[PDB]
Amino acid sequence: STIEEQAKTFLDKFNHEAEDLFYQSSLASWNYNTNITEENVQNMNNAGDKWSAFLKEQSTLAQMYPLQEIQNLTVKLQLQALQQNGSSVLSEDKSKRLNTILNTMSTIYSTGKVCNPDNPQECLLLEPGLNEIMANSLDYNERLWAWESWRSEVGKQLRPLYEEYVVLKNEMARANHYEDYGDYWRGDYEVNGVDGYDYSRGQLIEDVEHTFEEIKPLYEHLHAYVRAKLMNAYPSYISPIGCLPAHLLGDMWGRFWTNLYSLTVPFGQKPNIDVTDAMVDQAWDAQRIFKEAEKFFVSVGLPNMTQGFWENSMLTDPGNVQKAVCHPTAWDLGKGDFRILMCTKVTMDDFLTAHHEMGHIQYDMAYAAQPFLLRNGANEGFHEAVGEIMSLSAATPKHLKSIGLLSPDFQEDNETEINFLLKQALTIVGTLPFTYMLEKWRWMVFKGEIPKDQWMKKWWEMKREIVGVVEPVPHDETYCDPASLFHVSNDYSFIRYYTRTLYQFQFQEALCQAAKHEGPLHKCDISNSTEAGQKLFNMLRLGKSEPWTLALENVVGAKNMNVRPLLNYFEPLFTWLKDQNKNSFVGWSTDWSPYA
Amino acid sequence: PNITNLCPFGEVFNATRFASVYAWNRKRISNCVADYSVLYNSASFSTFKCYGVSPTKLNDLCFTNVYADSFVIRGDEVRQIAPGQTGKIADYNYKLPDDFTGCVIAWNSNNLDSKVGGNYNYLYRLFRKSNLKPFERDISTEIYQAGSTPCNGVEGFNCYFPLQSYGFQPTYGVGYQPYRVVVLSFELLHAPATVCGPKKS
Ligand SMILES: *[C@@H]1O[C@H](CO)[C@@H](O)[C@H](O)[C@H]1NC(C)=O
Ligand SMILES: *[C@@H]1O[C@H](CO)[C@@H](O)[C@H](O)[C@H]1NC(C)=O
Ligand SMILES: *[C@@H]1O[C@H](CO)[C@@H](O)[C@H](O)[C@H]1NC(C)=O
Ligand SMILES: *[C@@H]1O[C@H](CO)[C@@H](O)[C@H](O)[C@H]1NC(C)=O
Ligand SMILES: *[C@@H]1O[C@H](CO)[C@@H](O)[C@H](O)[C@H]1NC(C)=O
């Protein structure tokens, strides 16, 4: 008789058929990834095309039910994801051209080689290649050569493709009643229809700036300390006042500064935490790693893994001919099928990655009772932050001494905490200006504030202003330097990594106050405390059924993203860096003083 | 006397293929002796609730009519098969009365009913105009008219086929794996009762 009952019946039908077809698609993708075979590629293509055609047909049927006669907010949340036309609002020619453009972005980015000009005799791809020379080599000239070669090649390949991509995406977003495609990316954080908890998608570009203006002194001190320390390896190439050259940061894009820790460790004579030789002397195994992770999870009060998880996951390289994608991915196939695809070695980093992926798995099992549309994170940052909680908790000396891995008489003095917090800073606060700059550049490009002839000038200007990195040689619009990154070339939103890095410290402070930890936040372990686990599970269980502001307020008491836990986490490191930079040039002006 | 001519519970429980829940089989059991203690001693049954009896009262009380109803459901709605529950199977597929006097027997059948490509043969009724009466059966495939528009037998935006298939693949989690469920109904009428427990000689 009414609209809402018809909508609820349609949603039930869509939930059942979508669970079936999504399980088929996810099983096909799993069989492709754990078993590289062209038949599996064809099967995964067929399953993905069937799911895409089904989603397009049910999106066509969803427009017949108007939203403004529906009073139930859960029905609105389930129906808004169906009523989005997506790329289908374009013509068939434009949609086919956009799909072909995205595919050739993927194939160009995947197939890059590092062959020397006038020496084409032998070279590798990026992953056995550029990662090794950019991460481990201390030489200036070969790093500059690799940087210039890769960026020049992928810039000349990807420059007009990205221009057609931004034009087509702007047309698709303007047809879909959004202002721009960057505004379409901000639609994930938009909350409407809940009074008090409303969050406009234009408020996100205010909140990100408001958090970054309080990040900025800490990043200035970190950059000053790094620039002072980098003089020891590059005496003449860098200046004490100006910004850093781009190819010295230990990563191909400057996204993570983790590889610069070995060059910039404060106290090398102190025995740092390794727990890898002690792991291999105790003769651990991947099964032992994941069993200790599951023992850590049930200490907090989370439910343990199913037997199907243990019998179906691929935790070890399967064999000779069965090649697989070794990237760490947690898989939620639906219908109670949870499994982890991540190849393991006896490594502390693999232990932390196992904690990360098992946290993603626990987050996926938490919203299993939700209907199919609401089986997702509250925003795109929550699902990545929940694993980072487990990564921060497992890295503590208290958790390592609890499991008998670390030596019991290991002393946690000042230096052994400062050098660990510096590594955590190079992992975490180092990615913040690069992430905020990249998303601001993409938002200005998608908005149309930057013309074609000013892309690279504005990009390098904002890099010098925000990140404090100068280009090694001058570049022009014939290249497209930011498109060399995976996420921008493969149409991924990148603001998830900023929000992940603030929500992880908000959640960590909330759980450590819940776990009654009287010490500092970096030494806090949220293990063995059921009262923290219930508070965590109360927001894990919601899924997309609640606004992300309300789910955030359920655990931290604040309905907006906040930056103070990140600052008070790094507070001893901040005080040590402020006492370290008494005479060095803290901060920077925009300049070309190292290289013109 | 000697005990021979037992009830064929092995015919019901150990059947090769069970029925789907929208068309559940009902078998009348009469004029035989039944060993419920043998059923209880079998550890394979993952769920054994009795709502008006104990196995001791199963052995010590004679009954007139025993109806074995058998179907396949998922693990999550095993708790739905109970007196007074509300849920999709309990509303549209198989309704138990509030004053039920019987036993509900359920065990996992993932190693028989599941197959790798999906056993879509096990159906269930998703939409119906009204809830069922207790022990009602409806094998009708009438197109569900959710809106004011007539269906005229064809598929449409508001006219849905009422039956949906379970997937039942062996990689499913617990709660989505198939569970063979046998429900026994015990009642007394104005008739000579004949079914009763075995006698210790
Ligand atoms: C992996 O792929 C090969 C390619 O034919 C196939 O023979 C093999 O059975 C696959 N592995 C598994 C576990 O199915
Ligand atoms: C929305 O619908 C669901 C399913 O019928 C119901 O459980 C929930 O209470 C409804 N919400 C409101 C606010 O009426
Ligand atoms: C999970 O934990 C429960 C209760 O501690 C236990 O009964 C069950 O066997 C555990 N399952 C696994 C796979 O460890
Ligand atoms: C957590 O509790 C267990 C059980 O007593 C204990 O073995 C372990 O040492 C505890 N962990 C910490 C960090 O106290
Ligand atoms: C079913 O099969 C099992 C195993 O063969 C057997 O022990 C049992 O007696 C059979 N009948 C019943 C009613 O369980």
Numbering used by the authors:
A (entry chain E): 19 to 614
B (entry chain B): 330 to 530
Quote the study's own text.
The most prominent mutations are in the spike protein, which mediates entry of the virus into cells by engaging with the angiotensin converting enzyme 2 (ACE2) receptor. Despite being phylogenetically distinct, a common feature of both the UK and South African variants is the mutation of residue 501 in the RBD from Asn to Tyr (N501Y). X-ray crystallography and cryo-electron microscopy (cryo-EM) structural studies have identified N501 as a key residue in the spike protein at the interface between RBD and ACE2 that is involved in critical contacts with several ACE2 residues. Mutations that emerge in the receptor binding domain (RBD) of the spike protein are especially of interest given their high potential to alter the kinetics and strength of the interaction of the virus with target cells.
Local refinement of the RBD–ACE2 interface improves the local resolution at the binding interface to approximately 3.3 Å, resulting in unambiguous delineation of the Y501 side chain and other residues in the vicinity. The overall structure at the binding site is almost identical to that of the unmutated version, with the exception of local rearrangements that result in the aromatic ring of Y501 being accommodated in a cavity that is sandwiched between Y41 and K353 of the ACE2 receptor. Y501 in the spike protein and Y41 in the ACE2 receptor form a perpendicular y-shaped π–π stacking interaction. We present a 2.9-Å resolution cryo-electron microscopy (cryo-EM) structure of the complex between the ACE2 receptor and N501Y spike protein ectodomains that shows Y501 inserted into a cavity at the binding interface near Y41 of ACE2. This additional interaction provides a structural explanation for the increased ACE2 affinity of the N501Y mutant, and likely contributes to its increased infectivity. However, there are marked differences near residue 501, which is completely within the ACE2 footprint, at the very edge of the ab1 footprint, and well outside the ab8 footprint. To investigate whether the N501Y mutation increases the binding strength of the SARS-CoV-2 spike to ACE2, we measured the binding parameters between ACE2 and either unmutated or N501Y spike protein ectodomain trimers via biolayer interferometry (BLI). This revealed that the N501Y mutation confers a modest increase in affinity for ACE2, mainly driven by a reduction in the dissociation rate constant (koff). Taken together with recent reports, these 3 results are consistent with the hypothesis that the greater infectivity of the N501Y mutant stems from improved binding to ACE2.
